[PDB]
User: Which sequence fits this backbone?
């Protein structure tokens, strides 16, 4: 019920990080599905060439519209209502919220850029939704796609523990409070005593106030 | 001259995306170095256990300070001036700028969180610099570390073509203009004529104004 199609010239990168731990076992269980399309296999030319120099001059290469179009058209023949997305620094900033909106579609397609990007006609023709994972420049869209997929699949019911998932949701808009586990003492540093009292009321008070204080100090924008 | 130490419970994920294309060949050439430390190998216990339930209650698990400390101390014995960083949603927002500051150190260590995070004592004792790659929740720090490394290594001289690199720098603070390559016509859509005239002056004017218009429409914050 959660299908992601990844379009990439590096299919052997995938599943990669998406293949371990909860994501990976949820993938084996079939709680989500990952289809990785190799863009190169859709190159009709005798060259097998996916990229070419840009019209107008300037350095680098650009993914071609004909190759991309064949690949995307294949994806559309298989999944005609897929939500078409393009990893791009030029796109809207990915957030937990965009992640949730993205999941209201149950079939999502992520095009991974390489080189200097893709021919603009592909973006306009297919109305690709451009998405940036942040204000930094990656070498390719593959990491961005993995980031988007991990974020989304983490919220598919059954992928992570229910309690963890509910706690994560309820903490949204706040920074995580300090957390501790064994050993009791480490390099002479001890765990705050309240957390060792079993006093649920006081522990929860302490956590709320720590989160509140940390949030105001570092992410006041989260109000 | 650019050394990254990645601390992770999933060493087999790496190099992964960092191992392909320019990053990968620069890694083989030795323009940067990647040391992936397996946190599990530093678990002294008979259990081989890196994580444990948090003091004070609440769901999930947390990476232990004793295990992390042994691993990080090993890293410090080898690289005593390494810049210690921790992937965390609670951290400062990674940007091209933080990436450049990060590169003024030539030895960087990235701790990858898993589960609910790590024992806070580790953050305070080692003064870890917390870094978020965006306002979304990943399953682990590994993708964040890859994102940080890719961003940084992309600016190491010799990793990508000089011309591309200079163009990227000069376009900072602006959104990328529309780009085109062959074929001339695709699904009845043609390339803007100015880009086919060879007129460098007019092409550059057109690009500047497209970038300016797109930036104002979507990222006015980039002034
Ligand atoms: N922050 C980011 N978010 C999402 N995708 C990104 C990204 N940074 C790079 N990419 C991906 O990596 C590819 C190559 S980078 C493109 C560089 C180009 N000079 C430009 O400024 O746009 C992009 O096409 C895109 O798919
Ligand atoms: N946006 C982000 N940037 C950097 N690291 C992130 C991240 N999202 C998750 N992580 C990493 O993934 C690990 C597990 S997620 C931790 C979840 C916890 N409830 C919390 O809110 O902090 C984190 O310890 C961190 O290393
Ligand atoms: Cl591949
Ligand atoms: Cl569909
Ligand atoms: Cl592993
Ligand atoms: Cl050092």
Assistant:
């Amino acid at each position: 019920s959660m299908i992601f199609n990844v379009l990439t010239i590096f299919p052997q990168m995938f599943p990669g990080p998406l293949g371990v731990s909860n994501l990976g076992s949820a993938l084996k269980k079939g709680l989500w599905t990952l289809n990785v399309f190799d863009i190169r296999a859709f190159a009709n030319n005798k060259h097998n060439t996916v990229d070419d120099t840009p019209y107008g001059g300037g350095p680098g290469m650009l993914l071609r519209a004909d190759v991309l179009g064949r690949c995307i058209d294949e994806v559309l023949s298989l999944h005609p209502n897929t939500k078409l997305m393009f990893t791009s620094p030029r796109g809207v900033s990915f957030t937990q919220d965009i992640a949730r909106q993205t999941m209201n579609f149950d079939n999502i397609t992520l095009l991974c850029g390489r080189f200097e990007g893709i021919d603009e006609r592909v973006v306009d023709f297919y109305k690709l939704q451009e998405v940036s994972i942040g204000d930094y420049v990656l070498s390719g869209g593959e990491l961005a796609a993995m980031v988007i997929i991990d974020t989304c699949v983490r919220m598919v019911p059954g992928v992570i523990g229910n309690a963890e998932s509910l706690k994560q949701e309820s903490m949204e808009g706040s920074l995580e409070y300090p957390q501790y586990t064994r050993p009791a003492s480490w390099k002479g540093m001890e765990v705050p005593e309240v957390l060792l009292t079993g006093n649920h009321g006081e522990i929860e008070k302490w956590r709320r106030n720590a989160s509140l204080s940390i949030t105001a100090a570092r992410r006041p924008d989260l109000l």
Remarks:
- The pocket of S-adenosyl-L-homocysteine (ligand 1) is lined by residues A 87-89, 112-114, 116-117, 132-134, 136-138, 140-141, 144; B 168, 176 (CB under 6 Å).
- Helices of chain A lie at 21-29, 65-78, 96-103, 120-125, 142-153, 162-171, 200-218.
- Chain A has seven helices and nine strands.
- The two ends of chain A are 35 Å apart (CA to CA).
